[PDB]
Design a binder for this molecule. Structure first.
Ligand SMILES: COc1cc2nc(C)nc(N[C@H](C)c3ccc(-c4cnc5n4CCC5)s3)c2cc1OC
Length: 455
């Protein structure tokens, strides 16, 4: 074959090897890559024949699961440095025009996407950014000039990046605690509507901050979780803290009648979450009512009105049969919404545990890229809900109060959840032990203002 001899030799260039079942596999137009060696992945990422924006996006989202950022940069620079063949210039003019120029453009296309959509890599590693500017500095040619500028214009935008409502939002609601009196802020003293509004604004912001790479390769459960998954972990910790705070509010209210009022208020909070389509919020309340300390409180739930029970039961049924009702509800509503985040983590963990890192062919390891695309498709679903701002006014004091929630204190999670359950046994002992009475802890009126706003 003359076309293969037009390409460089194997002893001078590693990205012009023949394709086979020993180095690359395609899935069942543009071929979609099932698996392959890292060399073949870089080859197809910068393929001369066509543009592959789907593969570029998916590669750059997921590559950290099989290749370090330092390795990737080296490999795309090695790819870029295509050696010219020796002289006998008709062959050299075709080779430059039809192979070198396309591949070199495709490498810079990868660099542009890398810096525009995954600049955080270059924030985490300073030397990585120096190398990229070193490489983008030392270039040539008329066609590259535009790409070399566009890349360096994006880099300086991200250096600078380091350092309004459409309609009229509704009036902020208050109840017992007056505006400013932050010492009196609590579950029953703030207004339930406003608790729900401020948590939704907070959770919306945390949902939108999560980047796809934070979820790939289960990196949030590894040694470098705090650097690789800062927004993700912030979102999980909020959910952990809000859930355990609801549970703490209920079981530390030892008086039965006061505890009924606490539980009823949390169900009211959930009602406003569903008015707002904050599903994350709905399912935090559901998680709290189903926890071991709360779910067993039969005396408490006996006094909760039937309509409130029904609402809480209907919320639970969102999760039944692999979240069927939830998923039908989510696709049917209009913006704005906060999707339930927990399901995405569950399904990514099933993809990660359920598929192998590599595929065996003839004793050689090919990286399983279909595994990465599946994970990226799940992060794609996350992204489609990330541009949905709420027409709701921030209240900084209430925001700050829920931002600084720390129900566990200085306790570990297990010992705190053991405490909560032991507290549940104290306030409502198991049969046949009699139910003791406990004195009231609240000096203020327990009647809720309700969930209809003003006007
Ligand atoms: C399959 O088991 C469950 C079935 C469940 N079915 C339904 C319809 N809703 C569940 N959860 C919601 C969030 C509820 C929590 C508390 C609720 C309640 C209302 N009245 C009483 N309770 C418990 C003591 C007496 S309802 C389920 C939770 C389940 O596991 C925790």
């Amino acid at each position: 074959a003359e076309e293969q001899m037009r390409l460089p030799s194997a002893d001078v260039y590693r990205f012009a090897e023949p394709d086979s079942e020993e180095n690359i596999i395609f899935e069942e137009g543009i071929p979609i890559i099932k698996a392959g060696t890292v060399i073949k992945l870089i080859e197809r990422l910068t393929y001369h024949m066509y543009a592959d924006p789907n593969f570029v996006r998916t590669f750059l989202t997921t590559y950290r699961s099989f290749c370090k950022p330092q390795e990737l940069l080296s490999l795309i620079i090695e790819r870029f440095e295509i050696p010219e063949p020796e002289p006998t210039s008709a062959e050299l003019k075709r080779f430059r025009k039809e192979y070198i120029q396309p591949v070199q453009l495709r490498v810079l296309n990868v660099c542009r996407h890398w810096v525009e959509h995954h600049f955080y890599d270059f924030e985490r590693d300073a030397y990585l950014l120096q190398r990229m500017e070193e490489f983008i500095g030392t270039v040539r040619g008329k066609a590259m000039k535009k790409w070399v500028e566009s890349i360096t214009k994006i880099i300086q935008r991200k250096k600078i990046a380091r350092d309004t409502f459409q309609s009229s939002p509704p009036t902020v609601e208050w109840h017992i605690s007056r505006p400013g009196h932050i010492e009196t802020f609590d579950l029953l003293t703030l207004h339930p509507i406003e608790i729900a509004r401020q948590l939704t604004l907070l959770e919306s912001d945390l949902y939108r901050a999560v980047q796809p790479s934070e979820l790939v390769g289960s990196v949030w459960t590894k040694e470098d979780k705090e650097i690789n998954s800062p927004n993700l972990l912030k979102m999980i910790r909020h959910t952990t803290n809000l859930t355990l705070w609801f549970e703490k509010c209920i079981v530390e209210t030892e008086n039965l009648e006061e505890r009924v009022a606490v539980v009823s208020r949390i169900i009211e909070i959930l009602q406003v979450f569903q008015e707002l389509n904050n599903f994350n919020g709905v399912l935090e309340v559901v998680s709290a009512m189903n926890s071991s300390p709360v779910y067993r409180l039969d005396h408490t739930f006996e006094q909760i009105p039937s309509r409130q029970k029904k609402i809480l039961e209907e919320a639970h049924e969102l999760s039944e049969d692999h979240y069927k009702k939830y998923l039908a509800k989510l696709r049917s509503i209009n913006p704005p919404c906060v999707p339930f985040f927990g399901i995405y983590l569950t399904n990514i963990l099933k993809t990660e545990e359920g598929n192998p890192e590599v595929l065996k062919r003839h004793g050689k390891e090919l990286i399983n890229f279909s595994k990465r695309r599946k994970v990226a498709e799940i992060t794609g679903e996350i992204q489609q809900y990330q541009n949905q701002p709420y027409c709701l006014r921030v209240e900084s004091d209430i925001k700050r109060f829920f931002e600084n929630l720390n129900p566990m204190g200085n306790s570990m999670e297990k010992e705190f959840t053991d405490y909560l359950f032991n507290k549940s046994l104290e306030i409502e002992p198991r049969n046949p032990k009699p139910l003791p009475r406990f004195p009231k802890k609240y000096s203020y009126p327990l009647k809720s203002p309700g969930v209809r706003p003003s006007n």
